[PDB]
Prior knowledge:
Elements: E1 4-15, E2 22-24, E3 31-39, E4 47-55, E5 61-66, E6 72-77, E7 80-85, E8 88-94, H1 97-112
Bound molecules: yttrium (III) ion.
Subcellular location: Cell membrane; Membrane, Caveola; Nucleus
Protein name: Sprouty-related, EVH1 domain-containing protein 1
PDB class: signaling protein
Amino acid sequence: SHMSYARVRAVVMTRDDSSGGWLPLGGSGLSSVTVFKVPHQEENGCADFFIRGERLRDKMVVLECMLKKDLIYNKVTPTFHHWKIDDKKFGLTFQSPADARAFDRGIRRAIEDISQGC
Ligand SMILES: [Y+3]
């Protein structure tokens, strides 16, 4: 309900065997990327926040990650962002700078809301 922070269609990007490049994970197809909160117990107390990417054609979950307060966000272009949570990285190729900005507020609110509870 008020559990979702953002939902956009984008292409999931993974860091390549090269050194500093990014490529789309598998297909070049769009995925349904959402950011959401999952209550530990009480619907309004402490919770965990996840980023989830589901490929549109075969509904395969190609990305699933738990947000953490220390996470780093990187706006490279107005249409390409990538983040680092602990040791690994994921990135997104948005369809518009709009979607990108909407998603960014989303992740931002979610991160700030992480300690809501204790
Ligand atoms: Y808040």
